[PDB]
Design a binder for this molecule. Structure first.
Ligand SMILES: Cc1cc2ncc(C(=O)NCC(C)(C)NCC(=O)N3CCC[C@H]3C#N)cn2n1
Ligand SMILES: Cc1cc2ncc(C(=O)NCC(C)(C)NCC(=O)N3CCC[C@H]3C#N)cn2n1
Ligand SMILES: CC(=O)N[C@@H]1[C@@H](O)[C@H](O)[C@@H](CO)O[C@H]1O
Ligand SMILES: *[C@@H]1O[C@H](CO)[C@@H](O)[C@H](O)[C@H]1NC(C)=O
Ligand SMILES: *[C@@H]1O[C@H](CO)[C@@H](O)[C@H](O)[C@H]1NC(C)=O
Ligand SMILES: *[C@@H]1O[C@H](CO)[C@@H](O)[C@H](O)[C@H]1NC(C)=O
Ligand SMILES: *[C@@H]1O[C@H](CO)[C@@H](O)[C@H](O)[C@H]1NC(C)=O
Ligand SMILES: *[C@@H]1O[C@H](CO)[C@@H](O)[C@H](O)[C@H]1NC(C)=O
Ligand SMILES: *[C@@H]1O[C@H](CO)[C@@H](O)[C@H](O)[C@H]1NC(C)=O
Ligand SMILES: *[C@@H]1O[C@H](CO)[C@@H](O)[C@H](O)[C@H]1NC(C)=O
Ligand SMILES: *[C@@H]1O[C@H](CO)[C@@H](O)[C@H](O)[C@H]1NC(C)=O
Ligand SMILES: *[C@@H]1O[C@H](CO)[C@@H](O)[C@H](O)[C@H]1NC(C)=O
Ligand SMILES: *[C@@H]1O[C@H](CO)[C@@H](O)[C@H](O)[C@H]1NC(C)=O
Ligand SMILES: *[C@@H]1O[C@H](CO)[C@@H](O)[C@H](O)[C@H]1NC(C)=O
Ligand SMILES: *[C@@H]1O[C@H](CO)[C@@H](O)[C@H](O)[C@H]1NC(C)=O
Lengths: 728, 728
């Protein structure tokens, strides 16, 4: 066809995927960003109208980052001056705008540097965090009622997470949860007094004469963790001339014996809070159901209705214990739980009753409970066809658990095998979101019929463009390594010939609960390596991987660095048993956990790999964070699992790296997997005679995310792959 | 047959130069280590006696780092437990041993972690620094007096230097100076209170979980400097119940007007100190000459005894104002001053007189004054043959300044063109120390007659070893740019011929006062590049270089990054004009200042250089230290020289590096030229799109000089020059 997908197209984004990201604002209405105008669309009858003329700029002159409308409709927040912190955390400035008047509130403004803002779910109350303390505005033009006073930089956090709870427990900076009608404000406080700092240099722009040492409370494996308290405040009874009153609700006594984590907060009703707790050995978990009591102000959590969850073989959850989806009445909930057969399935709990009824079953897993109605529960799963790498929407009839209906399986079954869903409020309308194996398809539905109303974006211009390109295909299949299936994918070059020997990259992540063999569509680096340079970029899911039952996933418990690494050698070995793969040209690469896994493969002495690349790798598990590492490994005490902590290091395999070419990459401002880890790889290689290639990225974080640095890292890695595979 | 000088032979140190490391202890005797038996030798007659046996000090329990015999012979310091700090500084443990008995001094011992130790010049007194304070010890067994109390880590340095005084002022961790007979002890005090810290990480062993942040008071260009005060204690009047009085000698009013340094301390007489100060703009210096009185104990410095040394065109000194050489009576002195013509020569000063009288002149420079008797002043110079990178010993009859006589020129004129000298006490004997261009040759001589007594070491065993190895030859010659001779050296391959086109490396330092073209013999990395791989390694001293007058040296004044860069490029243009060099295979490399000029050459755009390697380079003069930088640059203020601080960065040349292959190298614990400096080069290259090779070194300093990291850096660089020059 004359043309390929080049590296320049990946880095500059020539061939664009169009998304259809909408925010629901009611039970029937949503917002979309059509050009620079924000339109509201009525999802029943189809019609739309312009809500924001004046764009993305003009209301003060500032380029706006977000447009959060209050749920009653009367007000709007304009977010400006975004300053990224870590993965979810940021600071910004916040002007509140009156929509019934069309004018700015210059009375009692939210101060710049604000860490978090959230409207109450009803009305127009605000709660915001600023300087580690919570603030509450009853009206947006009236003074803030301050609510905590204990906040201090790097030490006490009220209403926002610390480093490790952000990245590793909640997946979020926020630690405010409102009651559904707006009355109570629940919040968690974190305490980082005795937690040790990672210290790293930051060089800044050229004019900064002395480097800044950036210092971050960060527990690594075995270290002193943070501590957690949990509170509730009533907002309707805040005194205008006295202090707020925050009633603590203490964690259950089976948690207070050790170090523990608060891992979930979901309000069941206006007067009921569900709270999951996790022991530091993350295989024992306790939910409290905590009702208010109007005669005392307090929160009682009767131990009878608390629900225990545990693991005798791994850890509770996929990363954390799963979220309960309550029924409206308060008195029951559904929750994803691993069953007796090993597989993760929906389970119905009744508030004062032990155990659960499994409402789903089989050799496959539920991914998430998406929406709960009077008569249906909607869920995504990988059930369809026996493929653990596809996603489809389902609905269980709650009066007859045998009446499950797939709502997305058959809509376009060759093009669309990987769905997600965004439901409106009360679940009246649902936007399906296909994302492979053909081009992303975005469609709107009503829940009454399951009939489709409109097609929101079909990716037509993306299609028409890509018919010029010699595009690669994806094989998706399995290999039976015992009796059990293990899944894989291959991006194969265009014009692929089974009687020709191609070079073979493994893309690797490989960590606990990962998935790399999937039906998703991607325009990435691997698309350039197959399209232009004729490399098969394959990828394997082995022992330790997710979405397939705990006999696969929990294979790696107390044993990181072993079977996820060894089955990746077996995957390359197996692909080279097939006769379209060159034996003399087999690279391996990953980022992060895959950087780690790549280095352990390179240092195993297998013979199979000529070269590899490790970007921002872990190298030794005592250098990475406590919450993640000890979830799988235990504690690095010799009463526990110190022997495997020490036996699983990249450093202790340094000797075998002279059999291989090696590129090591890392960002010097990595707040996540610190530059330490790569500094310890490189020193071990130096101390044993091996030669390798290195590349630091000055000031770049864990994602190596800057536009110039992203262009550079992939250009450098391309030249490494091409020299290794003998390509001009 | 014949083998070749390989990289393995360089690294493992196969062909070893024997030196002759003697140490004078009298006017007629020296000590020399043989087998860890230290022997004393008699100079005239040549006989020896074993003074310390190798088997003695096994019972001690430790491997000894140094021996230091007292000037009366009654004692010895045994230094052990060496722990390097910076270039000259260290911490140690010290036992004293009695040589009239044969036992250790058991009580009143020098503490552990002592920073510096020195005997008085006559006798057996001990001044030591520990915890930043001076302690005096009149007899080895008696309790130590405590001279100072103000000592404080990182802040107050009594009798030792802070960072910048160690590196750039004294070349020495020491800041004690005894009087010749031992009655007085003088000291500097540095005050680093407001000097900004520089911060960097230290990762340490694999077992260290959090990286430590090293912090060092370090004044960068323009930043607040340390201050200085100067003191003298009479150590024959220390009270056993009260503190020692320390009389402070104050600097001249013409130094106290702004910032300044104390740059030389020389005792002239038993009651006469010479002190030499330098303004922060280092083109003005004042020598005070301060006499004691027994009338009060004050030290009065007469202004009718001050001598001013200015510079009209650059800075005072080669690196600092030169050391004075007092005659015995103390009333007159000789020092190396720049004459009217710009060339450095010996000037005879008389104390009360203003002017000086030149004792030498010509088109060459005096390197050092090495001895002063009543009849002769002995000096090293480059006069011989017109060669600015040769060295020879001279003597200058003080009764007749035209009766100059070269003591070393004609000894072995083909083998020996680079000398140094060590005289005995009172200058009765001298060791000459030839360094090339043949194998090093060590000889002893008598001063009364200039008769050679013996050969001490001749490197006979190395010469036998090298007859079976194909060694490279060395050309040392000159080009003529703008009517001036500028010298170069070429290390030419074995069996070299005029007809082939050889690839050319260009080794560089290039800094102010440097000399990379000389007559000294070396077995180095360049010897392997010539021997095995057939690479001409070349070197050139352009403008800015020393030894050739101030018309060449002060060309670079205020102007670093300018003519020294231009002239390494023009030297490589010129070397291509000779027909034996491949102009598609020029490369460039240096270390430190040489990595700065490598970088400024590689980013010039000249077309000459295909590749190069900057190791631990400067990149911006505001990141390097104040004392060095501002010597040649002024202050980085817009009232001074800011504009040229900004024009002369590597970063502002980043876009042009797209034309050249590039390897940037740096060790992360470099306390001298910080890892900051390469980290801002790489940011600049990234933010502009240019690929480059990188290499870091975890915990290596400015030297990159561990056994493992020395093997690894030179192996990695060897790969880069081979693959650039297309060599297998
Ligand atoms: C699809 C899905 C669902 C889900 N639910 C939770 C998380 C989650 O908690 N993610 C945080 C995580 C990225 C694992 N933090 C650790 C981290 O960053 N690590 C670990 C070692 C290497 C390095 C990397 N990369 C991720 N998903 N994804
Ligand atoms: C021949 C000779 C004799 C001598 N006596 C003293 C000094 C001296 O004190 N020199 C300053 C020095 C120790 C090199 N510090 C500066 C330094 O290390 N720099 C400067 C920028 C790059 C980096 C390097 N390399 C130099 N000489 N030379
Ligand atoms: C910071 C803090 O709360 N420290 C408490 C202190 O108040 C108490 O007096 C002491 C002895 O009982 O115990 C500490 O843990
Ligand atoms: C849609 O049309 C009806 C009026 O017939 C009404 O709901 C509203 O004006 C329109 N809504 C939107 C979002 O455009
Ligand atoms: C911060 O708030 C101030 C009010 O103090 C406002 O004038 C300004 O626009 C805000 N943003 C910045 C970047 O200062
Ligand atoms: C934070 O925790 C430390 C113990 O790590 C304790 O001393 C301090 O009192 C706590 N502060 C608050 C506000 O809870
Ligand atoms: C509220 O209490 C805090 C102590 O937690 C105190 O510092 C503050 O003065 C009180 N505020 C008011 C308005 O009384
Ligand atoms: C919200 O529910 C609470 C809890 O019972 C009740 O106190 C309050 O009256 C309700 N408020 C609103 C606005 O509905
Ligand atoms: C949790 O894991 C540990 C470590 O493998 C094990 O000893 C313990 O029995 C497990 N189960 C519970 C409920 O603690
Ligand atoms: C050298 O020999 C003479 C004569 O025996 C002796 O007096 C002198 O001490 C000896 N010196 C040494 C260092 O052995
Ligand atoms: C210094 O301490 C070491 C122990 O590290 C000990 O062996 C030695 O005897 C001590 N030396 C002195 C002079 O106190
Ligand atoms: C050191 O200097 C600081 C000013 O930076 C001053 O406060 C202190 O007194 C001085 N200390 C000594 C021992 O001179
Ligand atoms: C000075 O000496 C007295 C004893 O006379 C002693 O107490 C004091 O420590 C010394 N001075 C200082 C500043 O330490
Ligand atoms: C050293 O010279 C000084 C100054 O003249 C005098 O006070 C002292 O007596 C002399 N000491 C010795 C040991 O010669
Ligand atoms: C020192 O250098 C400055 C800066 O170039 C120059 O203006 C001045 O004349 C010199 N000052 C002295 C005291 O020689």
């Amino acid at each position: 066809s004359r043309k390929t997908y080049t590296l320049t197209d990946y880095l500059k984004n020539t061939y664009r995927l169009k998304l259809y990201s909408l925010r629901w604002i009611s039970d029937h209405e949503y917002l979309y960003k059509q050009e620079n105008n924000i339109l509201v669309f009525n999802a029943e009858y189809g019609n739309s109208s312009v809500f924001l003329e004046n764009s993305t700029f003009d209301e003060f002159g500032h380029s706006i980052n977000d447009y959060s409308i209050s749920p009653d409709g009367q007000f709007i927040l304009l977010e400006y001056n975004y300053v990224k912190q870590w993965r979810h955390s940021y600071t910004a400035s916040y002007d509140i705008y009156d929509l019934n008047k069309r004018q700015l509130i210059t009375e009692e403004r939210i101060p710049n540097n604000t860490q978090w803002v959230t409207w109450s779910p009803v009305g127009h109350k605000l709660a915001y965090v600023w300087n580690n303390d919570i603030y509450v505005k009853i009206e947006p033009n009236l003074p803030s009622y301050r609510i905590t006073w204990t906040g201090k930089e790097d030490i006490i956090y009220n209403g926002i997470t610390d480093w490790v709870y952000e990245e590793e427990v909640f997946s979020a900076y926020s630690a405010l949860w409102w009651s559904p009608n707006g009355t109570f404000l629940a919040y968690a406080q974190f305490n980082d007094t005795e937690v040790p700092l990672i210290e790293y240099s930051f060089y800044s722009d050229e004019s900064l004469q002395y480097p800044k040492t950036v210092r971050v409370p960060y527990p690594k494996a075995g270290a002193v963790n943070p501590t957690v308290k949990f509170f509730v405040v009533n907002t309707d009874s805040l005194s205008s001339v006295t202090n707020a009153t925050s009633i603590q609700i203490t964690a259950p006594a089976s948690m207070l014996i050790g170090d523990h984590y608060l891992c979930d907060v979901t309000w069941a009703t206006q007067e009921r809070i569900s709270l999951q707790w996790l022991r530091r050995i993350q295989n024992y978990s306790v939910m409290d159901i905590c009702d208010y009591d109007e005669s005392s102000g307090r929160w009682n959590c009767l131990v009878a209705r608390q629900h225990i969850e545990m693991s005798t073989t791994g850890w509770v959850g996929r990363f954390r214990p799963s979220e309960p989806h309550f029924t409206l009445d308060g008195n029951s909930f559904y929750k994803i739980i691993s069953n007796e057969e090993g597989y993760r399935h929906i389970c119905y709990f009744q508030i004062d009753k032990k155990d659960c009824t499994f409402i789903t079953k089989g050799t496959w897993e539920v991914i998430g409970i998406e929406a709960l109605t009077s008569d249906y529960l909607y869920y995504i799963s990988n059930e369809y066809k026996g493929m653990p790498g596809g996603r489809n929407l389902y609905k269980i009839q709650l009066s007859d658990y045998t009446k499950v209906t797939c709502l997305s399986c058959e809509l376009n079954p060759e093009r669309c095998q990987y769905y997600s869903v965004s439901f409106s409020k009360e679940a009246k309308y649902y936007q399906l979101r296909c994302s492979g194996p053909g081009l992303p398809l975005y469609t709107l539905h009503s829940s009454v019929n399951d009939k489709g109303l409109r097609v929101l974006e079909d990716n037509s211009a993306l299609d028409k463009m890509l018919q010029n390109v010699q595009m690669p295909s994806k094989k998706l299949d399995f290999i039976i390594l015992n009796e059990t299936k293990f899944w894989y994918q291959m991006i194969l070059p265009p014009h692929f010939d089974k009687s020709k020997k191609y070079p073979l990259l493994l893309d690797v992540y490989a960590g606990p609960c990962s998935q790399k063999a999937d039906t998703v569509f991607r325009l990435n680096w691997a698309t350039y390596l197959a399209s232009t340079e004729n490399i098969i970029v394959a990828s394997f899911d082995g022992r330790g991987s997710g979405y397939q039952g705990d006999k696969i996933m929990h294979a790696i418990n107390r044993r990181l660095g072993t079977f996820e690494v060894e089955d990746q050698i077996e995957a390359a070995r197996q692909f080279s048993k097939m006769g379209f793969v060159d034996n003399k040209r087999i690279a391996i690469w990953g980022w992060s956990y895959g950087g780690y896994v790549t280095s352990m493969v390179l240092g195993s002495g297998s013979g199979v790999f000529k070269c590899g690349i490790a970007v921002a790798p872990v190298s030794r598990w005592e250098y990475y964070d406590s919450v993640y590492t000890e979830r799988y490994m235990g504690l690095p005490t010799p009463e526990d699992n110190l022997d495997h902590y020490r036996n699983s290091t990249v450093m202790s395999r340094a000797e075998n790296f002279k059999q291989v070419e090696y590129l090591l990459i890392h960002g010097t401002a990595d707040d996540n997997v610190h530059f330490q880890q790569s500094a310890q790889i490189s020193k071990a290689l130096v101390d044993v005679g091996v030669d390798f290639q290195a590349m630091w990225y000055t000031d770049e974080d864990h994602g190596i995310a800057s536009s110039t640095a992203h262009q550079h890292i992939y250009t450098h890695m391309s030249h490494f792959i091409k020299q290794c595979f003998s390509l001009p």
